[PDB]
Ligand binder design. Structure first.
Ligand SMILES: Nc1ncnc2c1ncn2[C@@H]1O[C@H](COP(=O)(O)OP(=O)(O)OP(=O)(O)O)[C@@H](O)[C@H]1O
Ligand SMILES: Nc1ncnc2c1ncn2[C@@H]1O[C@H](COP(=O)(O)OP(=O)(O)OP(=O)(O)O)[C@@H](O)[C@H]1O
Ligand SMILES: Nc1ncnc2c1ncn2[C@@H]1O[C@H](COP(=O)(O)OP(=O)(O)OP(=O)(O)O)[C@@H](O)[C@H]1O
Ligand SMILES: Nc1ncnc2c1ncn2[C@@H]1O[C@H](COP(=O)(O)OP(=O)(O)OP(=O)(O)O)[C@@H](O)[C@H]1O
Ligand SMILES: [Mg+2]
Ligand SMILES: [Mg+2]
Ligand SMILES: [Mg+2]
Ligand SMILES: [Mg+2]
Lengths: 395, 395, 395, 395
């Protein structure tokens, strides 16, 4: 059955966060890493939640393009000239963090969709005409279908070989078992029972997820929704491929480090292979999107992606897809995130004038998600067989 | 008033069909005519109705294009790889009929629309700005409007001169008389009395329509919906034209023979002149579409048309249009069918990947429809005057 | 296939009606029969259609109760005082027919419902818990279910034994055969195949139906919608009962004669054994309800019934029920009509103040309906066996 | 995070159930306990799932009243006479279990509502006008509100004092923490923080819940949805009352034993205190309602309640209420179940004719729910203080 932290171990966690912010209450060093940006945002969250639709961290967008400027991205429903703004409502272009670390502030017109289609040979193969199951393939529950993220393997225990996808796609907490079928469930069409979810994460506190206190709100949670489905005993493991169709072979997970310079993650081009839209390319415009609900709980999603060439990055049903960094200097592409599914997982964002608002996509940090679920992504078909061999004699 | 066959004369037809099937229960001769394809389909209908949305006969579609291979087309809601198919679900690629006659089996992704717009000079003329009434012109009842099929003439009796159109467009069996008006009825706009329906066909059994037993179901009916509207006495017959605008003069009806080779009908380019779509071109992809309803009665529609150049072939309101075979070797075009109207008259079909599923149109065999209604199409304006002369002194 | 009268035989029928009204264009004899009332209404229809929602013939309703006064009932959407009426719009209280025959005029506030539930032991028995099939029992098509009217028998030919019900309940002119099942069709629940409709009437002209010209409109039709369903060979005829549950044994059809005094039909209490309402009682408030549609065709329904005790007389699904005259002087009750089904078959009517407007029910003259369908109602279970015996050796 | 049983330990349970059924494949002893009824139902489930909406065990209902006859209740959408039934469709009146144990079969017309208001002084007190919190009081999450079941206490560990309610009311598995507020959440109205859910059950397999194999389906689950909310540290515990308003003091949980005679549970009058409808009385008409979904998994809910005096037993929002057995022989009332919330938690049922179908309510066995959640109901206000005293010094 289900468990939640009690009143104890939460006030102790709340005092550990309040103490961190209490004690630490431009000619300084400019913020250069994600850690500094999140620290400044957390230490100025009270003035940033006043008239904003959300906050994030990334490079400033000026005249529609990234400017390689460390900043906190403040999201507003409608952005007007400061001549028509109240002096209180006007956001400051400079924010000072503890120790003199500072950054700029970006104002972006922003919106959400709410609760979450095209046609190609690749899309049809992923939807069921292919001879192999791999990253990008359709996965379906009895009511919801999405995209297969990656072929993973449990680190400890039985070391089962399975696949990772979005929790909302794979798991419905109104049903006893979360069975998964590739093309469709038996009630909706042809399909083969891939397996059932055996572990899934829904919400992780920011201190456990990032390792720091991303906000002053004691009720701060990350939207890391990932479900691990181990392949069934009767399922044909010979039909599982580790090649991500549309991009090819991939590398190990590129863990996003909060100490690294922002250019290592923000602004880097990404690719994706999903069920609905197939292969699409985009750019990581922001990180650690901070959303504050009307009920007083701070929500975090890791990656913000805007589709390149003004096209969209994902459609409905693309959730649970790998967000893979493209080949930087000719090396293997490396996944960095899974496409988050759920309410307000996508929306409209305003980068450039002379054209309509852009579509933005939220993502979940893949390295931290696998660390929390204790899974290893299988990137080689030879290593896939070894992991199956390692699982056969382990039981 | 209305009549239906009683319990007698329906059983006598029931064992008449059953006897034909009971007694007759690859190194043989391959099927080459529509008769052989329908025979094989009828003798294997039990294993083809299991997991299909319907069945037709035509040339196999491989890679999205016709492959001049005699085959039985099995329509499925979603076509997946046989790796994800149960062995029972998987269809056989070869079917054996009585006497060794055999054919291939083609699996097509299929869907239906249900219960059933563009702008050009031709469309405007057909909708009411033209000086003449002919094939393709708009015809309207008090609630439903459609397309005038062709100018026809009764073979026997009064030899009345009128026009043929779809039964659903012209006839509503909740109203005393089925009055018809060209542009619109008086309650919806300007118009003149074309006349009223005096005879209309709704359903003909397969043994009477095709001359053979197209299926093992005793309740097998052909959806041949054609209504004959003789022109009124006060209607100006001088404004009726036999020229099909958009294609010109036409020839007599090309009767579809079940003995002839499949290439004479299947895969041959067709043209149509209706309303809300004007002149369009398409290809006959299948014949004798067998649809089985949830209530245990087999339904048949003759022609299956997919619009050429990936464009649609008809829209709503095109029902009752001539399906005319285009000029084969420079001779006059000849009509082969009328566009059927009614529930699931059109739908969506999947030939090629890399683009969306295509629209398909159903049609009713024109030669057999006229044989059942005892009408002759007037193809020459000189013959139209003679037919009016023959009708004037006959009364 | 379907047939309709052509241009000929309709102008000849139109001239036979125009001649009747042309040649014949208070101190006289007051109207006393239905014939006189319909004659006066037909000869004054032009001034009665001006600002009325319909017309009928019956006894005048003053202060909410019948007054035993011959009159033409003029139906209005809203009835106001003549002080607020235009002098042209005000209806005349006296109408003069040919030969000096005259009647009063009644203004009744009227409305219609449009396109067409309680619980008792009798209702449950009729809906399927009973051991017998009879008048009032449920009959269901594949999409529509209604009430079994009466057990009938064809006069000529095979002399098949079956039952009569509403055409709209039993007949759908979009389907090949109109199969009937008592409780429910197989796709909706348990049931036995009662048989299929073999003959059904939809519209009969007034000259054929009543024997006179009920109106000046050449396009005048009666709404007689009755369908005869002969019982199947495999159907268990031993389970058919001729007893109308809730009223008992009945007599032969009481044909409504246009020469008789109005008290013989108008104002006489009626009973009905249908379904979704069970046994209900009402009063025949009007006869020959004349409705004029927006398209210029005059429609007629025979019987107008208002439920007694201010309760409703029928609900949706009661269509096809016997309208039976109650025991006048202790003799057997006799059916006079079938409950008509179809658009605007029921509606809301205003008799009395101090309470809401009442519900009215339309009916179809049963004697004329059986004359047109050539059926005899079986009223005795002994006669039912004889009719089955007479049908067994006749084939 | 969430966990589910893997492929192992489920096949081991699957063959454990299969072995029990394979080896054991009226002049015998009649069934007299719930165990025997469920055994016979499990051994005949294949022939009972054919044409039924579900199955339960209890006393036979004949003429609308319980007949103190051990029987298996088979629920049908519509119950008709066997004359209109297919002989295959007709259910047998006698069922034989292993060892000769037998029972009757009762057919009931059944329906379900789907996804789930009165005005009295008691209702207002429960909804928020009262000075104390107890059984029947309103409890609200941020989106769903329901009824407080009972004041409970953890058996082991911290021994926290809290309350039990429905899982669907208290827990939403799309939100980080399941906060609970009595009158309304802060976003919907006044109210204070009662606490948050720290443990909740959703589905328990039948072998763990009942201790037996209630069905042949390997995927058999009991819909036991209960959530425990420990009262907050800052919450005023002095305002919690153990008196169930409308019935008074209660006793300990009466555990339903599968060995005891059927009269101890089935047919016994019950009472309930819910926010929506206040105090209502009903009768336990069936036990262990077996519902089979379209996806092949068997669902079980424990108690079936029909409101007494033909009134309804609960309304929407009454979920999470105590189902309390009324005073049998003057002793203290004892709770036996919690009102289940969720899809198809209630519905409509047909006992008696001459009136509308009755409303039925599903319930969850309280004793087994507390055994699975390890909670003890506090029935005395003096014991409530001691439980709070025991919790204060334990930390
Ligand atoms: N609370 C607010 N709501 C709406 N608009 C605001 C708010 N606070 C500031 N703004 C607007 O946002 C502007 C700042 O925009 P921003 O920081 O994105 O500039 P930039 O990146 O240098 O350039 P650009 O707008 O061309 O991208 C202010 O000048 C003001 O017009
Ligand atoms: N019952 C079924 N439901 C869904 N898909 C099915 C079913 N039976 C077979 N199929 C699929 O249909 C395929 C057969 O396709 P088909 O016969 O149309 O091939 P083709 O014409 O040679 O080539 P192409 O598919 O390129 O047009 C099988 O390989 C299988 O994947
Ligand atoms: N075209 C019309 N539209 C609406 N109301 C009309 C129209 N013509 C007449 N009336 C109203 O109808 C009245 C006549 O009503 P009616 O003939 O039913 O009287 P009654 O039967 O003697 O009495 P009661 O109204 O009590 O039944 C007129 O006085 C006038 O107010
Ligand atoms: N599959 C089925 N679907 C619908 N109705 C059925 C089915 N099988 C049996 N029945 C009906 O249910 C009846 C049995 O009812 P049941 O066993 O409840 O009777 P009872 O309790 O003795 O009396 P009462 O019906 O008055 O409660 C059968 O006679 C038949 O009419
Ligand atoms: Mg900007
Ligand atoms: Mg093909
Ligand atoms: Mg009046
Ligand atoms: Mg019963």
């Amino acid at each position: 059955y289900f468990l939640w932290p009690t009143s104890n171990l939460q006030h102790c966690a709340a005092e550990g966060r309040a103490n961190y912010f209490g004690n630490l209450q431009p000619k300084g060093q400019q913020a250069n890493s994600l850690l500094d940006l999140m620290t400044i945002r957390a230490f100025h969250s009270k003035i940033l939640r006043r008239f904003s639709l959300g906050t994030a961290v990334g490079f400033r967008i000026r005249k529609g393009d990234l400017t390689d400027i460390p900043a906190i991205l403040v999201f507003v429903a409608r952005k007007v000239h400061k001549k028509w703004l109240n002096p209180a409502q006007c956001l400051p272009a400079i924010l000072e963090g503890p120790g003199g670390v500072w950054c700029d502030v970006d104002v972006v017109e922003f919106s959400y969709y709410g609760a979450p289609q095209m046609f190609s040979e690749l899309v049809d193969k992923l939807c069921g005409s292919d001879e192999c199951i791999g990253s990008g393939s359709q996965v379906a529950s009895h009511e919801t279908f999405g995209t297969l993220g990656a072929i993973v393997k449990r680190r400890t225990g039985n070391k089962q070989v399975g696949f990772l996808t979005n929790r909302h796609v794979a798991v419905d907490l109104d049903y006893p078992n979360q069975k998964m079928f590739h093309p469709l469930p038996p009630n909706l069409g042809p399909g083969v029972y891939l397996g059932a979810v055996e572990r899934a994460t829904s919400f992780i506190t920011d201190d456990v997820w990032y390792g720091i206190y991303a906000g002053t709100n004691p009720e701060t949670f990350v939207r890391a929704d990932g479900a691990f489905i181990p392949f069934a005993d009767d399922f044909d493991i010979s039909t599982v491929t580790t090649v991500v169709r549309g991009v090819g072979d991939i590398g190990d997970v590129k863990v996003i480090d909060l100490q690294c310079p922002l250019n290592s993650l923000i602004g880097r081009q990404v690719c994706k292979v999903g069920r609905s839209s197939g292969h699409t390319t985009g750019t990581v415009m922001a990180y650690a999107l901070e959303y504050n609900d009307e009920k007083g709980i701070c929500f975090f999603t890791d990656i913000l992606v805007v589709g390149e060439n003004r096209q969209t990055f994902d459609l409905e049903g693309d959730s649970g897809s790998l967000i893979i960094l493209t080949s930087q200097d000719g090396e293997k592409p490396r996944p960095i995130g899974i496409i988050w599914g759920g309410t307000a997982n996508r929306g409209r964002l305003k980068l450039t004038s002379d054209h309509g608002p852009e579509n933005w996509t939220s993502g979940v940090d893949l390295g931290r998600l696998l660390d929390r679920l204790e899974l290893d992504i299988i990137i080689t078909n030879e290593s896939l067989q070894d992991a199956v061999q390692q699982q056969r004699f382990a039981l």
